[PDB]
Enzyme design. Sequence first.
Site, PDB file in Angstrom:
ATOM      1  N   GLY A 119       0.791  -1.214   0.000  1.00 39.75           N
ATOM      2  CA  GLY A 119       0.000   0.000   0.000  1.00 39.75           C
ATOM      3  C   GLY A 119       0.825   1.266   0.000  1.00 39.75           C
ATOM      4  N   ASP A 120       0.135   2.402  -0.139  1.00 41.21           N
ATOM      5  CA  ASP A 120       0.767   3.723  -0.087  1.00 41.21           C
ATOM      6  C   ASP A 120       1.848   3.879  -1.155  1.00 41.21           C
ATOM      7  OD1 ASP A 120      -0.762   3.966   2.358  1.00 41.21           O
ATOM      8  OD2 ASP A 120       0.894   2.913   3.353  1.00 41.21           O
ATOM      9  N   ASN A 150      -9.748   4.354   2.668  1.00 36.68           N
ATOM     10  CA  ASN A 150      -8.357   4.604   3.032  1.00 36.68           C
ATOM     11  C   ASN A 150      -7.727   5.582   2.035  1.00 36.68           C
ATOM     12  OD1 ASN A 150      -7.900   3.112   5.488  1.00 36.68           O
ATOM     13  ND2 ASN A 150      -8.035   1.214   4.290  1.00 36.68           N
ATOM     14  N   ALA A 151      -6.874   6.474   2.542  1.00 34.35           N
ATOM     15  CA  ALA A 151      -6.627   7.778   1.909  1.00 34.35           C
ATOM     16  C   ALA A 151      -5.539   7.858   0.821  1.00 34.35           C
ATOM     17  CB  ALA A 151      -6.301   8.794   3.002  1.00 34.35           C
ATOM     18  N   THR A 166      -3.386  11.100  11.116  1.00 36.99           N
ATOM     19  CA  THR A 166      -3.080  10.324  12.311  1.00 36.99           C
ATOM     20  C   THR A 166      -1.625  10.495  12.760  1.00 36.99           C
ATOM     21  OG1 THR A 166      -2.773   8.042  13.133  1.00 36.99           O
ATOM     22  CG2 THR A 166      -2.872   8.314  10.723  1.00 36.99           C
ATOM     23  N   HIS A 182      -3.588  10.975  -1.985  1.00 33.52           N
ATOM     24  CA  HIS A 182      -3.330  12.391  -2.257  1.00 33.52           C
ATOM     25  C   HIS A 182      -2.928  12.634  -3.709  1.00 33.52           C
ATOM     26  CE1 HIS A 182      -3.404  12.020   1.990  1.00 33.52           C
ATOM     27  NE2 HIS A 182      -3.056  13.272   2.234  1.00 33.52           N
ATOM     28  N   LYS A 214       8.071   7.368  -6.353  1.00 32.23           N
ATOM     29  CA  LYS A 214       8.908   7.917  -5.287  1.00 32.23           C
ATOM     30  C   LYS A 214      10.395   7.651  -5.517  1.00 32.23           C
ATOM     31  CE  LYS A 214       6.793   8.415  -1.374  1.00 32.23           C
ATOM     32  NZ  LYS A 214       5.886   8.372  -0.171  1.00 32.23           N
ATOM     33  N   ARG A 226       5.137   4.835   9.112  1.00 29.45           N
ATOM     34  CA  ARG A 226       5.189   3.573   8.380  1.00 29.45           C
ATOM     35  C   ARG A 226       6.541   2.904   8.519  1.00 29.45           C
ATOM     36  NH1 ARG A 226       2.544   6.940   3.736  1.00 29.45           N
ATOM     37  NH2 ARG A 226       0.386   6.989   4.498  1.00 29.45           N
ATOM     38  N   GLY A 258       7.532   8.130 -11.060  1.00 26.18           N
ATOM     39  CA  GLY A 258       7.191   9.216 -10.161  1.00 26.18           C
ATOM     40  C   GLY A 258       8.425   9.839  -9.542  1.00 26.18           C
TER      41      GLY A 258
HETATM   42  N1  LIG Z   1       8.442  12.228  -3.061  1.00 24.29           N
HETATM   43  C1  LIG Z   1       7.377  11.614  -3.749  1.00 24.29           C
HETATM   44  N2  LIG Z   1       6.091  11.498  -3.099  1.00 24.29           N
HETATM   45  C2  LIG Z   1       5.057  10.840  -3.859  1.00 24.29           C
HETATM   46  C3  LIG Z   1       5.290  10.371  -5.121  1.00 24.29           C
HETATM   47  N3  LIG Z   1       4.141   9.782  -5.559  1.00 24.29           N
HETATM   48  C4  LIG Z   1       3.211   9.917  -4.592  1.00 24.29           C
HETATM   49  N4  LIG Z   1       3.784  10.592  -3.547  1.00 24.29           N
HETATM   50  C5  LIG Z   1       3.206  10.899  -2.277  1.00 24.29           C
HETATM   51  O1  LIG Z   1       3.385   9.510  -1.494  1.00 24.29           O
HETATM   52  C6  LIG Z   1       2.313   9.276  -0.774  1.00 24.29           C
HETATM   53  C7  LIG Z   1       1.522   8.020  -1.271  1.00 24.29           C
HETATM   54  O2  LIG Z   1       0.718   8.425  -2.402  1.00 24.29           O
HETATM   55  P1  LIG Z   1      -0.850   8.004  -2.504  1.00 24.29           P
HETATM   56  O3  LIG Z   1      -1.294   8.530  -3.855  1.00 24.29           O
HETATM   57  O4  LIG Z   1      -1.628   8.616  -1.406  1.00 24.29           O
HETATM   58  O5  LIG Z   1      -0.815   6.457  -2.351  1.00 24.29           O
HETATM   59  P2  LIG Z   1      -1.977   5.404  -2.553  1.00 24.29           P
HETATM   60  O6  LIG Z   1      -2.566   5.018  -1.241  1.00 24.29           O
HETATM   61  O7  LIG Z   1      -1.281   4.242  -3.214  1.00 24.29           O
HETATM   62  O8  LIG Z   1      -3.045   6.023  -3.447  1.00 24.29           O
HETATM   63  C8  LIG Z   1       1.479  10.562  -0.879  1.00 24.29           C
HETATM   64  O9  LIG Z   1       1.797  11.364   0.198  1.00 24.29           O
HETATM   65  C9  LIG Z   1       1.928  11.178  -2.227  1.00 24.29           C
HETATM   66  O10 LIG Z   1       1.722  12.640  -2.181  1.00 24.29           O
HETATM   67  C10 LIG Z   1       6.641  10.503  -5.764  1.00 24.29           C
HETATM   68  O11 LIG Z   1       6.878  10.090  -6.866  1.00 24.29           O
HETATM   69  N5  LIG Z   1       7.623  11.133  -5.042  1.00 24.29           N
HETATM   70  O1  LIG Z   2      -4.429   2.233   2.544  1.00 25.28           O
HETATM   71  C1  LIG Z   2      -3.678   1.504   3.193  1.00 25.28           C
HETATM   72  N1  LIG Z   2      -2.318   1.787   3.200  1.00 25.28           N
HETATM   73  C2  LIG Z   2      -1.412   0.987   3.918  1.00 25.28           C
HETATM   74  N2  LIG Z   2      -1.862  -0.125   4.660  1.00 25.28           N
HETATM   75  C3  LIG Z   2      -3.271  -0.429   4.668  1.00 25.28           C
HETATM   76  C4  LIG Z   2      -4.171   0.326   3.982  1.00 25.28           C
HETATM   77  N3  LIG Z   2      -5.403  -0.205   4.194  1.00 25.28           N
HETATM   78  C5  LIG Z   2      -5.260  -1.280   4.994  1.00 25.28           C
HETATM   79  N4  LIG Z   2      -3.941  -1.406   5.294  1.00 25.28           N
HETATM   80  C6  LIG Z   2      -3.299  -2.415   6.117  1.00 25.28           C
HETATM   81  O2  LIG Z   2      -4.032  -3.606   5.928  1.00 25.28           O
HETATM   82  C7  LIG Z   2      -4.089  -4.349   7.171  1.00 25.28           C
HETATM   83  C8  LIG Z   2      -5.534  -4.544   7.553  1.00 25.28           C
HETATM   84  O3  LIG Z   2      -6.170  -3.304   7.816  1.00 25.28           O
HETATM   85  P1  LIG Z   2      -7.743  -3.121   7.561  1.00 25.28           P
HETATM   86  O4  LIG Z   2      -7.878  -2.986   6.054  1.00 25.28           O
HETATM   87  O5  LIG Z   2      -8.115  -1.812   8.243  1.00 25.28           O
HETATM   88  O6  LIG Z   2      -8.490  -4.280   8.161  1.00 25.28           O
HETATM   89  C9  LIG Z   2      -3.261  -3.544   8.167  1.00 25.28           C
HETATM   90  O7  LIG Z   2      -1.897  -3.969   8.105  1.00 25.28           O
HETATM   91  C10 LIG Z   2      -3.387  -2.132   7.608  1.00 25.28           C
HETATM   92  O8  LIG Z   2      -2.389  -1.233   8.029  1.00 25.28           O
END
Ligand SMILES: Nc1nc2c(ncn2[C@@H]2O[C@H](COP(=O)(O)OP(=O)(O)O)[C@@H](O)[C@H]2O)c(=O)[nH]1
Ligand SMILES: O=c1[nH]cnc2c1ncn2[C@@H]1O[C@H](COP(=O)(O)O)[C@@H](O)[C@H]1O
Lengths: 413, 429
Positions: A14-15, A40-41, A289, A43, A319, A293, A401
């Site tokens: 994730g993320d 789940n969020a 929050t 940006h 990233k 990570r 990215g």
């Molecule tokens: N430095 C950097 N930050 C990035 C890049 N791509 C995304 N981000 C940031 O990394 C974090 C994860 O991106 P996000 O789109 O929220 O991840 P998702 O949950 O997979 O949709 C966010 O804070 C982004 O603003 C990148 O290429 N470089």
């Molecule tokens: O959007 C996300 N980003 C990173 N970890 C996530 C995300 N959604 C769920 N997880 C992870 O998935 C597991 C289960 O979380 P749950 O989806 O809230 O039940 C935990 O390890 C969470 O931290």
Amino acid sequence: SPEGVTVVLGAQWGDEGKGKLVDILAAEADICARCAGGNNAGHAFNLLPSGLINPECTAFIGSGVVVHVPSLFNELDTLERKGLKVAGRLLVSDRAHLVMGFHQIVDGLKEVELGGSSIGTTRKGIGPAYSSKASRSGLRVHHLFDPTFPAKFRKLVEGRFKRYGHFEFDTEGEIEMYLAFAERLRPFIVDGPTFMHNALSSGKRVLVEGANALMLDLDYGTYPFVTSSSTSIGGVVSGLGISPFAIKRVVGVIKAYTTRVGGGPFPTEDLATVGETLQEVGAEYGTVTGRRRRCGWLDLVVMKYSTMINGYTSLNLTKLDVLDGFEEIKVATGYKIDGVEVEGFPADLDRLAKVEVQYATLPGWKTDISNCKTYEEFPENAKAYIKFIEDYLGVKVQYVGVGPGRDQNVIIF
Amino acid sequence: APSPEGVTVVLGAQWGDEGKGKLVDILAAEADICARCAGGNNAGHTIVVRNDKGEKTSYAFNLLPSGLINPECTAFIGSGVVVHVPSLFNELDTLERKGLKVAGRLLVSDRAHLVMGFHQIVDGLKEVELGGSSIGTTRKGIGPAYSSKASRSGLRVHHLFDPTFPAKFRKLVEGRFKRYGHFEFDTEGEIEMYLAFAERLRPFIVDGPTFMHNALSSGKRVLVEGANALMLDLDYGTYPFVTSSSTSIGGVVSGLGISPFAIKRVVGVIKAYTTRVGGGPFPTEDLATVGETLQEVGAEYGTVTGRRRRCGWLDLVVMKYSTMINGYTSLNLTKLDVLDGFEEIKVATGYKIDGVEVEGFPADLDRLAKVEVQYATLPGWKTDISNCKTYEEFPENAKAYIKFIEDYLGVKVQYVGVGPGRDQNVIIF
Ligand SMILES: Nc1nc2c(ncn2[C@@H]2O[C@H](COP(=O)(O)OP(=O)(O)O)[C@@H](O)[C@H]2O)c(=O)[nH]1
Ligand SMILES: O=c1[nH]cnc2c1ncn2[C@@H]1O[C@H](COP(=O)(O)O)[C@@H](O)[C@H]1O
Ligand SMILES: Nc1nc2c(ncn2[C@@H]2O[C@H](COP(=O)(O)OP(=O)(O)O)[C@@H](O)[C@H]2O)c(=O)[nH]1
Ligand SMILES: O=c1[nH]cnc2c1ncn2[C@@H]1O[C@H](COP(=O)(O)O)[C@@H](O)[C@H]1O
């Protein structure tokens, strides 16, 4: 972009930067869809598909999603307050399941009950909602207009009290509130299968935003340290109720290093200065929050497995700029147990714990790449890093990215 | 007719009991691997084989893929399945006593989930607890196993070799006791029984993703035997009167952990009339003589008390919806012979609610209950088709029935079932 479905999937835990890529690709899509998972969020998007900044893109929430309705409208009303016209461009499957307040509470209660064995869930009630779904006691969007909703809701609460004991919960207040939101939700509701079938038949381009990521997949992730839905490609097929034949592209979002948040194994985790540097430079913490990570090196053993399950047609390496300051960069290329090479990725986490990680060490570029706009502008050692990944995985990197901005994406082909 | 490299899928298109077994048998002859991707032990098939002395032998399958009837096939149980291990070995041992070799040809994903004795018990307890609103589950523990899976408390095949299996098993029992009260359950005896099965299961266990990926990359022909049917799908069926797995095509992709690009063929099994077992609306249900005739001539009784089947006309509104979701490449029309005595045959072609054409199939069962069904009435053939072996032999009005279905759904009928016997099929192309 071809007619049919393009999928963006998270490849690790994730993320990775899915939301960012979806915002980019949504410029070329007619519809942007969520197929599974809950809020789940990314940006200001959580439940809503991240393609809505394209004024002409329609957002769709599929049947496979679990929806916390009060959160949906908080999200929507905020976007509108910012000036984005969303309300006429959002459709929600009447078969999506409903996350209730008590799901969020018992998520936490179970986590406490587990003690040291807790999963580290996000406490948003996602697991309890998917468990109620499997039980077929769960309530769905269409139930919001069903006169038996209150009685069924009361019985659900009663069952949670049996399992977890008494907890404070305003049952009647919550029912009242949900039915109030039902009136606001009504215009958004559609029959999901016919909506998507009509779109595909009409030659529309559909962009699917995967939630979470592959190593959190209920079947294929590091179970039980996973989320409770299919985060993988099958979840797109099920969550939207489409033919596999409609899938044209599957883009794997692969972060240039690895993170996970919550419990469970993490073979390349760094508990020292590398981890701290990735955390700080990569801003790897929750936006509201402050939830920090776990960070570690890129793990291509994980990525090989991820690619096996999802069948990526290309990769988005994200990233990459976070590694701009590193003198040397390690990349996991193999797992050994007892000096013997491990096949694939193990289901048994005690076996995974025995792994000795084999690393390649690649030279850093020690250059700011955040203003690079084309592949040719990359430093040679950044190019080498990209090629190393491609050659290992047998899948080409299509997008790179180099910063958080929409504009900080390099298209290679 | 050769099967392609990659995945061929057989899916039930209605509410189950369509007659999938015969087509799985037909296609297993041209499969390298025969796989279950989801569901549990509700895929009961009997295949009756004639030997070179002209003697017939009946072989029964359920959890085990029926394609084992092809002695050269390998059977695979995917990660998406829920496995009652005692049942698996009862099934296996019964087959081997009849001369069918299974051990050595059977592989089981180490990520498949385990159905425990207590899952079957609480399946029943919940159903009783629901009273008049019971779902009509098969009480085989399938729902509770999938619920435990979603919670992530469930145990998987790899846990059978995990030193903490006894402790985790006890905690699972304790949780069910909290939810449902104390029921009789020999927790320690069950643990012991499962550790014993673990040793029998050891040779079969495989990494599922690797096994299937290697199979696909080496050009194997993989036949997937879908369990249950589309209108029992957890997402798309008549919820809550559904099973707790994805019975639809996405459950193949998830349940085997493969790319959608591996799917080559998806054959929908459509019975020539409709049956249901369980509660909720049934638009084309007949509660009079037609329903009784379908039930008797189609032998629609089942094998368990309380699961005699509701019967009604063919419903192509249901089939349009089913086709939308599953994307059938062709159809297998089954039990066409059951209509051999009908003078007229009704087929549902449309739903209206409050005078307006419903599009698709309604998620809300109170809306479903209100549907006004539009029927086509087709003339019967009034002739016995059960000895037909070629399409040309069909009577004109049976041909017309087939064509009506094809034209309405936009999918061709490739296989027609005209009797219960192994070879009572017509292959059209
Ligand atoms: N430095 C950097 N930050 C990035 C890049 N791509 C995304 N981000 C940031 O990394 C974090 C994860 O991106 P996000 O789109 O929220 O991840 P998702 O949950 O997979 O949709 C966010 O804070 C982004 O603003 C990148 O290429 N470089
Ligand atoms: O959007 C996300 N980003 C990173 N970890 C996530 C995300 N959604 C769920 N997880 C992870 O998935 C597991 C289960 O979380 P749950 O989806 O809230 O039940 C935990 O390890 C969470 O931290
Ligand atoms: N009269 C008749 N019976 C059939 C036909 N095809 C299958 N059957 C029988 O219908 C019953 C259900 O078949 P089965 O393969 O077990 O169905 P499944 O539940 O879809 O897997 C079996 O007893 C079959 O022998 C057919 O074409 N005509
Ligand atoms: O193989 C089948 N044929 C007909 N109905 C089924 C079958 N499997 C499950 N069902 C129905 O699906 C619902 C759930 O049953 P379960 O799969 O035992 O949980 C009930 O309505 C069952 O009758």
